C-alpha cells in the first residue's frame, strides 16, 4: 500500500510518494507520483536543474571550458565534487569558470560580462577550443541572450565552437530538467555538425555513462576486444567534437535512460539509429548486454569468448562475496536509475536484499522499472527527505546503505555503514570487474570492526570488547 510515515503527518501529500510493495497487489494502482514539485522546508535531497546540465553531463567532457554565466557560487559549488577521470590529466576536474556576475550586471545586463569572460577563458588556455555556456538563476531571470553572445564570440574566434544551455536552477523541480534541456539542445544544434572516420564495420554510441571512477574506460576494454568503434560516449571520458558525430553510429546503447534517453530517442527518430537499453552494472547483466550488442552486430562468438574469459577471471571472487553477503539488507538512496540497475543484480549476484529505495528525481518511468524488479516488503520512495530516512531505517534496519557521503556520515551515528552510491568507494563499479569492486566495498563496509566497537559502552561491567574475524576473496 501507499504509506503515510509518522514524520509526514503534517505533509500528508507524501503518502502518494511512498509505496510499500505487498503480496497480490496490482502495482499499477500504487505507482508513486514522481517528478512533481518539491515541498519547501522538507530537507529533500534534490538539487537544481543547472546541476543536471553542467555537473552531471557537460562537465564530464575532457576538452571543454565550462563557462557558468552567473555569480561565483554556482561555479564554486560544482568544482571538487565529482569523480570522472579522463585520459588527459583530468582537465575537467581541475577547472571551473564563472562570469562573476555583480550587481551592475543584474541591473544593466550581463551579456558583455559573459562575452569578455569567454574571450578571457580562450586567451588563458589557447589549446582549448570548445566551450559550453550555462545560465544560472539570475542570468535567466534578467534575460541575457547567451546564444547571441556565443554566436558573436564564434564569429570573432574562428578557432572555437560554443554550445549554450538555458538551465537556471529553478527550472523544473530537480536535476532532471537540466538533463532534458542539454540533451535536446545538443541534438538540435550540434549533432551532424562534424563527422569522423569510421574504422570498423560495427559502430555504436554509448549513451548515458559518465565515467565515474573510470567506468567508461573499463567498458571500453570490452568494445576494443570486440572490434566495435564507439563513435561517441555521452559523455564519459568524452570530447565535444565526438558528440557532434553521434548521427554516424549504427546502434545507441543506453545505460542511463533517465538522463540520456532523450537524445537516444531523438537520434532514433531523426537518423533511424536503434535504442538498446542495457544494464552496465551487474555481473549477469553485463553478460546479457554484451550478448545483445554482439547479436545486433552478428559477432556472437566474439562476445562468448569475452564473457567466458571475464567469468573465469572474476566470478570466483564474486561468489566468495556472495557467500558472505547473502541475506544482508541494503538500502539505495540515490538519483533513481541505480535503484532499478542494482535491486535485482545485487539480489541475483550477491544474495543481497534491497529493503528500501529512494530516488531524488526519478520519473514515473523509473518507478515502473524499480517496482517491476524489486522485492515485496520493500519501501519505494520518491523525493525522500531526511526525517523519512530515519523512520525507514527504524522500519527496515538495513545492514548497509548506498547513498551520498553526507547521508553516509549521518547514518554512521546510528552505526550503519555506507558505500558511496554516487561517486563509489573503490570503483569502478560497472562491468564484470566493477561488480566485484562493489561487492568488496559492501563486504568491507559491513564486516568492519569499528561498527562492533562503537556499540560497546565501556562503562557497562557486563560488556566486554569483542574481536571480529574478517576475510578476503
Amino acid at each position: 500500500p501507499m504509506v503515510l510515515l509518522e514524520c509526514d503527518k503534517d505533509i500528508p501529500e507524501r503518502q502518494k510518494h511512498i509505496y510499500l510493495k505487498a503480496p497480490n497487489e496490482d502495482t499499477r494502482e500504487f505507482l508513486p507520483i514522481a517528478n512533481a514539485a518539491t515541498i519547501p522546508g522538507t530537507l529533500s535531497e534534490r538539487g537544481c536543474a543547472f546541476c543536471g546540465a553542467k555537473l552531471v553531463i557537460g562537465g564530464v567532457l575532457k576538452d571543454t571550458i565550462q563557462m557558468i554565466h552567473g555569480p561565483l557560487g554556482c561555479a564554486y559549488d560544482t568544482w571538487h565534487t565529482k569523480r570522472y577521470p579522463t585520459d588527459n590529466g583530468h582537465f575537467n576536474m581541475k577547472y571551473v569558470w564563472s562570469t562573476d556576475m555583480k550587481e551592475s550586471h543584474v541591473v544593466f545586463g550581463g551579456e558583455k560580462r559573459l562575452e569578455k569572460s569567454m574571450h578571457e577563458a580562450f586567451d588563458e588556455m589557447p589549446d582549448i577550443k570548445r566551450m559550453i555556456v550555462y545560465t544560472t538563476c539570475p542570468t535567466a531571470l534578467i534575460g541575457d541572450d547567451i546564444k547571441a553572445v556565443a554566436k558573436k564570440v564564434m564569429k570573432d574566434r574562428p578557432d572555437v565552437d560554443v554550445f549554450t544551455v538555458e538551465c537556471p536552477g529553478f527550472s523544473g523541480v530537480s536535476q532532471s530538467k537540466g538533463h532534458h534541456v542539454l540533451n535536446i539542445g545538443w541534438i538540435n544544434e550540434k549533432v551532424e555538425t562534424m563527422e569522423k572516420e569510421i574504422t570498423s564495420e560495427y559502430t555504436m554510441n554509448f549513451i548515458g555513462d559518465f565515467n565515474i571512477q573510470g567506468d567508461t574506460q573499463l567498458l571500453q576494454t570490452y568494445w576494443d576486444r570486440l572490434g566495435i568503434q564507439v563513435v561517441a560516449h555521452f559523455t564519459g571520458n568524452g570530447t565535444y567534437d565526438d558528440l557532434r558525430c553521434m548521427h554516424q553510429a549504427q546502434l545507441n546503447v543506453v545505460n542511463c535512460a533517465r538522463s540520456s534517453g532523450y537524445i537516444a530517442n531523438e537520434l532514433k527518430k531523426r537518423y533511424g539509429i536503434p535504442r538498446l537499453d542495457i544494464d552496465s552494472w551487474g555481473f549477469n547483466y553485463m553478460a546479457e548486454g554484451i550478448r545483445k550488442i554482439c547479436a545486433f552486430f552478428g559477432i556472437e562468438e566474439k562476445g562468448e569468448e569475452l564473457i567466458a574469459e571475464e567469468y573465469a577471471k572474476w566470478k570466483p571472487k564474486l561468489d566468495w562475496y556472495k557467500e558472505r553477503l547473502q541475506g544482508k539488507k541494503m538500502a539505495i538512496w540515490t538519483g533513481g536509475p541505480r535503484l532499478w540497475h542494482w535491486t535485482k543484480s545485487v539480489e541475483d549476484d550477491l544474495g543481497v536484499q534491497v529493503v528500501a529505495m529512494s530516488s531524488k528525481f526519478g520519473h514515473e518511468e523509473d518507478f515502473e522499472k524499480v517496482i517491476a524488479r524489486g522485492k515485496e516488503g520493500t519501501y519505494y520512495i520518491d523525493d525522500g527527505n531526511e526525517l523519512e530516512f530515519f523512520e525507514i531505517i527504524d522500519l527496515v534496519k538495513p545492514d548497509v546503505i548506498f547513498t551520498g557521503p553526507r547521508v553516509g556520515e549521518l547514518v554512521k551515528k546510528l552505526h550503519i555503514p555506507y558505500v558511496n552510491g554516487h561517486g563509489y568507494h573503490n570503483g569502478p563499479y560497472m562491468g564484470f570487474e566493477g561488480f566485484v569492486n562493489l561487492a568488496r566495498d559492501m563486504y568491507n563496509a559491513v564486516h568492519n570492526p569499528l561498527r562492533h566497537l562503537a556499540a560497546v559502552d565501556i562503562r557497562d561491567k557486563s560488556q566486554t570488547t569483542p574481536v571480529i574475524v574478517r576475510g578476503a576473496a
Binding site: 518539491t38 569558470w97 544560472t136 529553478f170
Partner: protein, 466 residues
Amino acid sequence: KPAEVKLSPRDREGIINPMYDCQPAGAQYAGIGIKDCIPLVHGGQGCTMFVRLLFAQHFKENFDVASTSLHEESAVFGGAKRVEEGVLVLARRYPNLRVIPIITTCSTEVIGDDIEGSIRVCNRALEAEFPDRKIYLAPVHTPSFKGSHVTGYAECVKSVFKTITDAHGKGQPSGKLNVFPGWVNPGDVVLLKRYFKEMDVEANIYMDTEDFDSPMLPNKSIETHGRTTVEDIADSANALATLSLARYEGNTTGELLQKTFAVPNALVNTPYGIKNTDDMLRKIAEVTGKEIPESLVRERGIALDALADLAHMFFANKKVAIFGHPDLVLGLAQFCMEVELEPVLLLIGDDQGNKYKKDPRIEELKNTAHFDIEIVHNADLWELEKRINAGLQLDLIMGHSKGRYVAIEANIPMVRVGFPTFDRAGLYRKPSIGYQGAMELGEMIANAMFAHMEYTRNKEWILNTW
C-alpha cells in the same frame, strides 16, 4: 630599491577557480553553529544542497539546512509562499526548532521577494498554530552577486544577533566576554576555551562549533550540533566587552552590540602566530583585569622551542604563497615572518578591496618585510597558477583544498589551512590560532617540506641531526 608591498586587483573580469563560495554559503555556515537552528535558504535547490555537501567535505559530517525550493512558477510570480510554507513545514516537523535564518540568494534578491513581509506572515501563522513556542526568524540578505561567503557569514551573524537581542533587550550584566573568533575550526574553538579557562575568564564563543566533531556513541545519539543557544546570543547584550578576532568575520556584530547596548568592542589582530596571540591575551587582561597565567607562558615557550628547531634550518628565505579568508591570509603572513618564511604572494578572493587597503596589518607588513609582497585582491586561484606558470618560484603554498591541483602539478609542498580542507584527515580538530596552533602550523610546514625532500631526493639525508 626598497622592498614594496603592492595591492592589486585581478585583471580579468571572469573567474577561473574561485577562492570562495557565495554569500548564502557563508550565511549557512553561521547558522549551523546555533543550537536548535535550521537555516532556510530561499532560492533554488542547489543553493542549499551544494553547501550541505561542502560542509560534509570539510567536516565529514551532516548539517541540517533546508531549501524553499524555488521553481518556475515562483521565479515568475514571486516566492513568498515558498518561504512561508518552508517555515511552517520546518516548525511542524522539527518540534525543538527555535531559530530560522531566512537566507536570500541571487534568485530571490533579483525577483525582489519581501522577506520581512513573509516574516510578519509567518510570525502571525506560528503564533496561532503554536501558541507555546517562540521561533526566531531572522532576515538575512545575501545576494550572491556581491561579496563572498566571508561577507555572508558576517551578515548572518549580525542579523541573527540583531533579531534575538531585539526580542530580549538588555538586562542583568553577565560578567562575561563576547568572543567572535570568526570562521575557524573546532580545534580553534577548543584552544580558545582552554585559554579562557586558564585565565579564569567567563566567555561565550560565537558560534561554538566544538561539537561539530561529534562522537559515534554506544547509544546512537546524534550530537553534531552548534552549542550557541538563543539564551547565549541574547546574553551578548549584557557582556562586559566584546573581543572580535576577525575584522571581516564578526567584528560588525561587535560594533552593532557597542552601538545598541554600549558593550565595548575590542577588535584585535586575528591570533595567528606568536605576537598576535600575545596581543590578544594582553587585550583580554586589559578588559577583564585578569592576569595572563603561567600556563600560557609555558605553552608559548613550548611553541617557540619547537619553531626554533625549524626556522633558520628549514624555513629561512623560503618563498610562500598564501590564500584564504582575509583575516587568515594576513595573520598567516605575520606568522610566516616570525619563523623566517617569506610570504611573497597573498591572495584574497573577493570584491572588498576598498576595505583591505585600510587594514592596519598591510601597514604592519610594509614596515617589516625585506622582500616584495604582492597582495592580489578579488583573486581567483588561476591568479596563483598563472603566476607560477610565468616563473614565480615558490617553496610552499598555504591554502584550502580547492587549490590542491595547483600545488600537485607544480610540485610545490602545500599546507592545508582555512576552509575547506577536505583532502587531508583531521585538520578541523587541529588548532591553527594561538601558541599551540603556531606550533602545529610550523610543524605541518616542516613535515610537508620533509616529505617533499624525500620524494624529490633533495638532500633527503639531511633529516638526521637537525
